[PDB]
């Protein structure tokens, strides 16, 4: 009773079917009639009939996006028999018209990225229970006069990326989220939103766009014109919380728009010409509950002012929590320039990226009572997907792991070619610092970070730092995470570089990333280190038969639990060197190397090793008695290797093994001696796709084992392809006699 | 009589044999006895005996570098029979000792990158005619007076050897002494008293400043520098070249140059001479110095406001090139460069990697013949053992650009937009490099008004906007425009790209629009130019354009060279191909996905000499190429899927001198294709990498190779047989 081709799974007393991206030519009839949610996206399905989902009467959600994957002939009333269907997704299907005969039960319909030009009452007005309707990316969109009027339960109407030219009349009063982005609406009137008194979101972005790095076609509003919003256009939107007016070429903001909007929480004014409006800011007094204000990329092309002209009225934004001021472009940030922002109590984020600031007076950040994120990346500071927000930077400015430690300052991608003596003077108690991609060739000695000694997460990636001095970075006593990835040394001394003895002077350093540092010579000991990433280095050079000085390289890291030794060009690991690894290791990664052999016997000296990663290697053989070497290995990843034979009893050897990855190997068949179930194992997953399975009668022994052991979940059944013979080539091993 | 495996060639009434990089297991005996110079480098040769070069009695030069290529067992007196041998090169051979029994006739011996630890009189003292001796990259035991008998020794290079001391008893005839990275910490008065004719002295790398060293670097323990005695160079009157780079020098003694009036090149890079540059007492002792390099002399952690240049710099009357990289200073002022302004020959100022926040550009008008101003890798804001390991020898600015006149290189700076006062108060600039600045200037026709005589403008690696019809048109005399790797930052749907600015140039000859991601053109969809000669359109999307842009390049009537490579072209429309400039003499449609090519269309291009269709997926050729072209001198079809050469193809076009058919799917060449009814001037035919079926079917072509010796077939060792097993790997010319 193994499910094929869908991957059935239990989810809150229900069964979901993950049947996506598996080259299905037609809707499969081998789906259990008890499933509730069906996902058939990214397949080659071409026809949808009334007898496609027969028997599956409990289907509450159907996904049919991207079909055929790089149109879709849906018959009239094909989904009418599904009386319990609530969510129907039909995106990127090249649908010429809205599917006729849709079920009345529908509460969520998505028709994004189709060829729909007519929004008629014939295909929409019958769906009276619709909560969310998405008609994005579809000469002019013909919308029926009062097509949405009958949808009394409509909460979300998204008509973005459609040449509407005008706001559609007769919208339901129940509407809460109206999306009209890039809809060529050049004029907004008083009567346009009077009916929707419960609107919590209004998206008018992209109408009269400012063509700057647009991720889609951009055409300005002819004659430098902006969106023409009427004075009383938003006079009856009392419950408005989200207002997106990005890329609207706005030059003046009318304060009368926000006089009857006391709950406005998020205001997006990015990609506009509001340098003058930021300096005067009469509209800022009308926003006493605004929490997020984005005024990014509002620069005047060719204008490089000495300072930023921030209005005094910015002090009236009492509820402000985050201010995004990227792309303003100014040469200097002085203490007096940010005076109207220091008294704000909840302001914890200041975004100032891509401003080309030659120098910032860092003494002003002490005045901000509750700052937590100071994003100054991509400046000139010197030593000493249709379901996305296309205009706002939604990804966290500073990595959550870093910002979690406290005060976060991002000085990455600046002109800090060395750490000056007054680099961090007069700064707050910074606990997260980013100095990435600064080409910083500082010779660290132990006094550079004395002004901010409580840095717990330090990012020094993509630099040319020199940490050979035994006291480098040791001034940061409470340091826990150190990132030195992609560090190309600049003062390499023959009998000195690399000298990693600075690590021993840290009582609480937990994570260290020395990846891609080109470490091929040393000249390590730690009581608190837990994870070391040594990938992208030259361990093959360090582990040679001439000098055996690097046999006990990581033996001093007694508390180490995670070690990444990938991408080290390791052809062979000396047995003595492998045995001198931390016995406390619970996760070892020797993937993406050139390991021809692996001594499985040595695993005896690591009784807590749970995850062994040997992917992307050139291994050929496995051991006959893995139980005799490990009694804890829960996961063993051996994908992309040259293993051609599974040894006798391998599946029953280690009883603690729950995940075994053998995908993309050279396995022709699995013999009955390897499947011997004398003992009971808890193998919950076995990957085998990409193997050249000989689909003759020899594979029959393994086929029966799959049906007997249903608990061993084998993923990607459609990708477990038979390489021989011709008639069975391409087909799955489970589709045989 | 076709030469194999060497490539014999005439050179000034002599025969040279290019027998390099051909996987030779042993010295070949199939070399014509009349050859003079033999090159057997980068091969797998393991043994050298007295009967290896037998018969080749006229060998004046033998090269045996890198053997075996990634040691060399040379017998005693293996080269003694070669009485005319002058130049013997034995580099990277893992030679444990200097080869014994070397011929007395030798005038040039190179033993670089070997395991030679003893320089004994047994293997050197007999060679009395040696002009040049190279013993670099080999403690080193040097015999007391081993070089004393070499009365004709002009060049002695003992660099990259742990010598510790200058070898005693060197010949007085020495003119070029090389002692770089030799661990010589002390230099005395008696060390160079014997060599009165020394024109070059290299003491670099002794007590090195470990900064970005290209080889192992160990400082002189205790921050010490090279200890040069006061009177160490008191008898080197003819010294012209002095290299003291990476010597950790902090003070330069002026008494060193009191008896050195002809010193021309002084290298002081990678030192600690910031204080010595400010006081410069030694600068008065150099009235004929032409090249002064003081690069990478910065104090680590020191970022001064200005550069402290000594007043004594004005006494360097003969100075023509000053290299001041890696000093690291925030601001260049007119006052700081006052000592250099009255020098009558100063033509080059190197100021790269200085992190200068801003320069007062009106100081550059104060020079006499300032031809090169290199300011790359600064912070200016809007408005191989045979190499010089310490000096930047490659031209600072491309020769093609600097030849136009005064050249200013402002690449890799902080100029994110061309400010209004970006070029005000600058000299009459003829070459301008604004590369890799992330310049997002919307060019309108007034940005370069202060320097309107720019003839070669390099605007590569920027985010420029040239959609305005009057962009760059202020540079009336513009000849070369380089817009490579330009990522449009303000792409307007019905406007970008708009290349109508090109038509307003009366003398624009070369335009490089490579990798600009040009997949859409507007209004004047077609480009028009009366003076353009070369257009590089590679790295664009011509497949999208040709899938209303049929006559895209038809307006460039004077165009002779066109590069349409890397355009993801699967099929070129016949109408579009015919609407190409008829004046084209060189077309490059290589590195695409062309399945078919209409050879018939070549009739409308009577001046086309070079057709490049490499790296494509072509399968067939035409039966009557003579009927379509009467000028095609070169046809490159390498890396394609051509499996059959049509009948008479080699005799069709008589003007064809070079035909490239390498890395194709040719199994054999039939006798109908080799039909020589007419006489052709095919001087070269490439065929390596083809899966040649080395059966009796290849015999027809083998005879044609011997009959037509004028058709030179290069890389004979790489024309490998794919079948059968016994002939697999072997060359097609090594068959019965
Ligand atoms: C103009 O400005 C407005 C306001 O900022 C923007 O509106 C936002 O638009 C985005 C994209 O359309 C919306 O994001 C999506 O929200 C869905 C609902 O989220 C709620 O529910 C989930 C639980 O179901 C909660 O976790 C969540 O916190 C919310 O309470 C999500 O289901 C979506 O997720 C899917 O897409 C993302 C991105 O691809 C994936 O990472 C997810 O895994 C998942 O597949 C998505 O996050 C957002 O909610 C809108 N805001 C509001 C308040 O409605 C406009 O987009 C903007 N216009 C332009 C053109 O920029
Ligand atoms: C230098 O080396 C360091 C150390 O390895 C790297 O830092 C780590 O990077 C990894 C990613 O590469 C981080 O792991 C990720 O953490 C995310 C957040 O985890 C928190 O939140 C979840 C709940 O949302 C908690 O369960 C968790 O305990 C944490 O509190 C996860 O969401 C990520 O999960 C994704 O990947 C895993 C596989 O790795 C999947 O199984 C998941 O389904 C999911 O797709 C992921 O685990 C890790 O946290 C970082 N550590 C630190 C200390 O920062 C640096 O990135 C590296 N530097 C460079 C330049 O490469
Ligand atoms: C310290 O400073 C001194 C002085 O600057 C440096 O000395 C120079 O060292 C280089 C490298 O050893 C020398 O360069 C070589 O010169 C050979 C001779 O050149 C003359 O003859 C040819 C004609 O035969 C003329 O064209 C030329 O103008 C000269 O008159 C060349 O034959 C060499 O060429 C070969 O190598 C180069 C580079 O790989 C290739 O491009 C060529 O194709 C060819 O294969 C080479 O150019 C230079 O001549 C020395 N100067 C003097 C005045 O002798 C020291 O090297 C420096 N020390 C350190 C450690 O940096
Ligand atoms: C954007 O596009 C432009 C135009 O194509 C590029 O500029 C040209 O770049 C090529 C190289 O890619 C240049 O060609 C080279 O010129 C050298 C100088 O030529 C003169 O000097 C030599 C003697 O030193 C004379 O023999 C010659 O006749 C000229 O007077 C040559 O030395 C080079 O020759 C070598 O390569 C060729 C094959 O390419 C061999 O046949 C030769 O034997 C030799 O090995 C070569 O010809 C060309 O001069 C540049 N033109 C201009 C106007 O500058 C840009 O580089 C490109 N930009 C980017 C970023 O790619
Ligand atoms: C410290 O600052 C650096 C520099 O800004 C941060 O590095 C940047 O991190 C982001 C997110 O990981 C990278 O962006 C991603 O790039 C991939 C590949 O193009 C893309 O698929 C993702 O969607 C996303 O855009 C970015 O490339 C990277 N930049 C550099 C220069 O490394 C770093 O994350 C910051 N560290 C902390 C602790 O916050
Ligand atoms: C204008 O300024 C730019 C930036 O300084 C110059 O580009 C640089 O040119 C050099 C020489 O062509 C490049 O170096 C070469 O790289 C190749 C490939 O690695 C190598 O084979 C050569 O030996 C040499 O090192 C360099 O990469 C390139 N840098 C960039 C950022 O493009 C440009 O040449 C200048 N143009 C003019 C007209 O002066
Ligand atoms: C005409 C003009 C242009 C710019 C400008 C130039 C620019 N050049 N490069 C920019 N950004 C690159 C990509 C992101 N990372 C940094 C760089 F690589 C950039 C941004 C910008 C304005 C958005 C701030 C500023 C002004 C006043 N006027
Ligand atoms: C401790 C210290 C370091 C530097 C310095 C930093 C640097 N950061 N990055 C440098 N150069 C990279 C390669 C070339 N291109 C730009 C970058 F990529 C570089 C050079 C340098 C000294 C040679 C000038 C300067 C000073 C006073 N003190
Ligand atoms: C649908 O689900 C209900 C339980 O919610 C169950 O009683 C019924 O048998 C299911 N019907 C089908 C066709 O699976
Ligand atoms: C700050 O945020 C908290 C919720 O995190 C809220 O209770 C408080 O009232 C806010 N303060 C102001 C002044 O808006
Ligand atoms: C805060 O700013 C005020 C002026 O706005 C100044 O008087 C005060 O000293 C500053 N304090 C700190 C800690 O920055
Ligand atoms: C190492 O750092 C210490 C502390 O700053 C300093 O005193 C010492 O001179 C440095 N030593 C080296 C070898 O750089
Ligand atoms: C090992 O690491 C953990 C986490 O950093 C730490 O709490 C623990 O004290 C360390 N154990 C020893 C023995 O140092
Ligand atoms: C594993 O290593 C031990 C030494 O640590 C050695 O005796 C044994 O033969 C090795 N086994 C294999 C299969 O290499
Ligand atoms: C060597 O060259 C001379 C002419 O310079 C010639 O007469 C003689 O025959 C040549 N010898 C050999 C062996 O080729
Ligand atoms: C300048 O250089 C030229 C040769 O290019 C030379 O004739 C002239 O005398 C030099 N002038 C001085 C003052 O050295
Ligand atoms: C040259 O500099 C002098 C001062 O040294 C100044 O008076 C003169 O105007 C400058 N001329 C030019 C063309 O820069
Ligand atoms: C084009 O450039 C001209 C000349 O600078 C300017 O007057 C005009 O406004 C620009 N037009 C556009 C469409 O950018
Ligand atoms: C073609 O180009 C050359 C070189 O730029 C130029 O000299 C010639 O006058 C041009 N011919 C015509 C007809 O414009
Ligand atoms: C070449 O193009 C012409 C039209 O320009 C067409 O008639 C002819 O058939 C084409 N030949 C091939 C082989 O495609």
Swiss-Prot record, chain B:
Ubiquitinated by RNF216; leading to degradation by the proteasome. Proteolytic processing occurs in monocytes and monocyte-derived macrophages by both furin-like proprotein convertase and cathepsins. The cleavage is necessary for dimer formation and subsequent activation. Endosomal receptor that plays a key role in innate and adaptive immunity. Controls host immune response against pathogens through recognition of RNA degradation products specific to microorganisms that are initially processed by RNASET2. Recognizes GU-rich single-stranded RNA (GU-rich RNA) derived from SARS-CoV-2, SARS-CoV-1 and HIV-1 viruses. Upon binding to agonists, undergoes dimerization that brings TIR domains from the two molecules into direct contact, leading to the recruitment of TIR-containing downstream adapter MYD88 through homotypic interaction. It is found in: Endosome membrane. The chain holds residues 31 to 818 of 1041 of the full protein. One of its GO terms (biological process) is response to virus. Its main location: membrane. GO terms for molecular function: DNA binding; double-stranded RNA binding; identical protein binding; pattern recognition receptor activity; RNA binding; signaling receptor activity; single-stranded RNA binding. Disulfide bonds join 6-19, 207-220, 210-217, 401-431, 694-721. Glycans are attached at residues 12, 50, 58, 73, 118, 197, 235, 243, 308, 312, 345, 366, 433, 468, 504, 512, 558, 598, 670. Activated by RNAs having enough uridines. Changing residue 494 to V: In IMD98; increased NF-kappa-B activation measured in a reporter assay; results in increased TLR8 protein degradation. Changing residue 496 to A: Abolishes responses to both ssRNA and chemical ligands. GO terms for cellular component: endolysosome membrane; endoplasmic reticulum membrane; endosome membrane; external side of plasma membrane; Golgi membrane; plasma membrane. This is Toll-like receptor 8. Changing residue 465 to A: Abolishes responses to both ssRNA and chemical ligands. LRR repeats lie at residues 84-105, 106-126, 129-143, 152-173, 174-194, 197-218, 238-259, 262-284, 288-310, 318-339, 345-366, 369-383, 404-425, 428-449, 453-473, 477-499, 507-528, 531-548, 558-579, 583-603, 607-628, 631-652, 655-676. Homodimer. Interacts with MYD88 via their respective TIR domains. Interacts with UNC93B1. Interacts with BTK. Interacts with SMPDL3B. The gene is TLR8. Residues 1-736 are extracellular. Changing residue 328 to A: Increases activation of NF-kappa-B. Residues 690-736 form the LRRCT domain. Expressed in myeloid dendritic cells, monocytes, and monocyte-derived dendritic cells. Belongs to the Toll-like receptor family. It is linked to Immunodeficiency 98 with autoinflammation, X-linked: An X-linked disorder characterized by onset of recurrent infections associated with lymphoproliferation and autoinflammation in the first decade of life. Mostly males are affected; carrier females may have mild symptoms. Features include mouth ulcers, fever, poor early growth, hepatosplenomegaly, lymphadenopathy, polyarthritis, and non-infectious enteritis. Keywords: Disease variant, Disulfide bond, Endosome, Glycoprotein, Immunity, Inflammatory response, Innate immunity, Leucine-rich repeat, Membrane, Receptor, Repeat, Signal, Transmembrane, Transmembrane helix, Ubl conjugation.
């Amino acid at each position: 009773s193994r499910s094929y081709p869908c991957d059935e799974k239990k989810q809150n007393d229900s069964v979901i079917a993950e049947c996506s991206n598996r080259r299905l030519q037609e809707v499969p009839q081998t789906v259990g009639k008890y499933v509730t949610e069906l996902d058939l996206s990214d397949n080659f399905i071409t026809h949808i009939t009334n007898e496609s989902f027969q028997g599956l009467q409990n289907l509450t959600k159907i996904n049919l996006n991207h079909n055929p994957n790089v149109g879709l002939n849906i018959t009239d009333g094909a989904f009418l028999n599904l009386k319990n269907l609530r969510e129907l997704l039909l995106e990127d299907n090249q649908l010429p018209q809205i599917p006729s005969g849709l079920p009345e039960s529908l509460t969520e319909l998505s028709l994004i990225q189709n060829n729909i030009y007519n929004i008629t009452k014939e295909g929409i007005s019958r769906l009276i229970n619709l909560k969310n309707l998405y008609l994005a990316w579809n000469e002019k969109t013909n919308i029926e006069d009062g097509v949405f009027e009958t949808l009394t339960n409509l909460e979300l109407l998204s008509l973005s990326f459609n040449s509407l030219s005008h706001v559609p009349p007769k919208l339901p009063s129940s509407l809460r989220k109206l999306f009209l982005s890039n809809t060529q609406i050049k004029y907004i009137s008083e009567e346009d939103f009077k009916g929707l008194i419960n609107l919590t979101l209004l998206d008018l972005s992209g109408n009269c766009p400012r063509c700057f790095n647009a991720p889609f076609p951009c055409v300005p509003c002819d004659g430098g014109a902006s969106i023409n919003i009427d004075r009383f256009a938003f006079q009856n939107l009392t419950q408005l919380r989200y207002l997106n007016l990005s890329s609207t070429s706005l030059r003046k903001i009318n304060a009368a728009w926000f006089k009857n909007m006391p709950h406005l929480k998020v205001l997006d004014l990015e990609f506009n010409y509001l340098v003058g409006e930021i300096a005067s800011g009469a509209f800022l007094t009308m926003l006493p509950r605004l929490e997020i204000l984005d005024l990014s990329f509002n620069y005047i092309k060719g204008s490089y002012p000495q300072h930023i002209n921030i209005s005094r009225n910015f002090s009236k934004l009492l509820s402000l929590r985050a201010l995004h001021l990227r792309g303003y472009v100014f040469q200097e940030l002085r203490e007096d320039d940010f005076q109207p922002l220091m008294q704000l109590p909840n302001l914890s984020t200041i975004n100032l990226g891509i401003n080309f600031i030659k120098q910032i007076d860092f003494k002003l950040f002490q005045n901000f009572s509750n700052l937590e994120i100071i994003y100054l990346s991509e400046n000139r500071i010197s030593p000493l997907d249709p379901h996305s927000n296309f205009y706002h930077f939604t990804r966290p400015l500073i990595k959550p792991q870093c910002a979690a430690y406290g005060k976060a300052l991002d000085l990455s991608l600046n002109s800090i070619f060395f750490i000056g003596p007054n680099q961090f003077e007069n700064l707050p108690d910074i606990a997260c610092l980013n100095l990435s991609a600064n080409s910083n060739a500082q010779v660290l000695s132990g006094t550079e970070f004395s002004a901010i000694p409580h840095v717990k997460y330090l990012d020094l990636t993509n630099n040319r730092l020199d940490f050979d001095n035994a006291s480098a970075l040791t001034e940061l006593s409470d340091l826990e995470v150190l990132d030195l990835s992609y560090n190309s040394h600049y003062f390499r001394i023959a009998g000195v570089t690399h000298h990693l003895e600075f690590i021993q002077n840290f009582t609480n350093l937990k994570v260290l990333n020395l990846s891609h540092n080109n470490i091929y010579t040393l000249t390590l000991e730690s009581k608190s280190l837990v994870e070391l990433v040594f990938s992208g280095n030259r361990l093959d050079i360090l582990w040679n038969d001439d000098d055996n000085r690097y046999i006990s390289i990581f033996k001093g890291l007694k508390n180490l639990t995670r070690l990444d030794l990938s991408l080290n060009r390791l052809k062979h690991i000396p047995n003595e060197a492998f045995l001198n690894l931390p016995a406390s290791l619970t996760e070892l990664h020797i993937n993406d190397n050139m390991l021809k052999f692996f001594n499985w016997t040595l695993l005896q000296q690591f009784p807590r090793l749970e995850l062994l990663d040997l992917r992307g290697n050139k291994l050929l053989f496995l051991t006959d008695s893995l139980s005799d070497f490990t009694s804890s290995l829960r996961t063993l990843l051996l994908s992309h290797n040259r293993i051609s034979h599974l040894p006798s009893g391998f599946l029953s050897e280690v009883s603690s093994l729950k995940h075994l990855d053998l995908s993309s190997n050279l396995l022709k068949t699995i013999n009955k001696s390897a499947l011997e179930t004398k003992t009971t194992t808890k193998l919950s997953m076995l990957e085998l796709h990409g193997n050249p399975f000989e689909c003759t009668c020899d594979i029959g022994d393994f086929r029966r084992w799959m049906d007997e052991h249903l608990n061993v979940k084998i993923p990607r059944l459609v990708d477990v392809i038979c390489a021989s013979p011709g008639d069975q080539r391409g087909k799955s091993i489970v589709s045989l006699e």
